[PDB]
Design a protein around this nucleic acid. Structure first.
Ligand SMILES: [Mg+2]
Ligand SMILES: [Mg+2]
Length: 132
RNA sequence: UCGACA
DNA sequence: ATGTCG
């Protein structure tokens, strides 16, 4: 009951808050389909969220109906809500991540999608394929 | 008072 | 250690 015909996304960091990156992979093959350049300060949950939204945009642009897997219950909720409820402080070091979060929410509020966003069941299936 | 996902 | 929700 793993839907192999899917995109898996995940965050990586150094610190939390700290340097954040994320990527998207083909769940079947492991092939890296997109990878974001490291953002100097952000949170895990912000990155998990940006990964999902990147994935929605990636699949939409390519007319793909594949679902997206994420391991992040937080991010899955933020995407469903179109709203990332982060605590991270706003200052000049966090301005970049907060601009990207704001632009992701804005994309969600201006586009449609029917991509199923699914929880990757780590406890049964091991680490998601996009794990760092 | 936790439980869970990262 | 921290970020987040049920
Ligand atoms: Mg994750
Ligand atoms: Mg991971």
């Amino acid at each position: 009951e793993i839907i192999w015909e899917s995109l898996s996304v995940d965050v990586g960091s150094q610190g939390n808050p700290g340097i954040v990156e994320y990527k998207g992979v083909d769940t079947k093959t492991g092939e890296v389909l997109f990878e974001r350049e490291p953002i100097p300060i952000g949170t895990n949950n912000m990155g998990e969220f940006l990964a999902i939204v990147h994935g929605l945009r990636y699949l939409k642009e390519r007319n793909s109906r594949k679902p997206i897997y994420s391991n992040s219950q937080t991010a899955i909720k933020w995407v469903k809500d179109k709203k990332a409820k982060s605590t991270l402080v706003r200052n000049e070091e966090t301005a970049l991540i907060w601009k990207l979060v704001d632009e992701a929410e804005e994309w969600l509020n201006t586009h449609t999608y029917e991509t199923p966003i699914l929880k990757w069941q780590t406890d049964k299936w091991g680490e998601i394929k996009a794990d760092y």
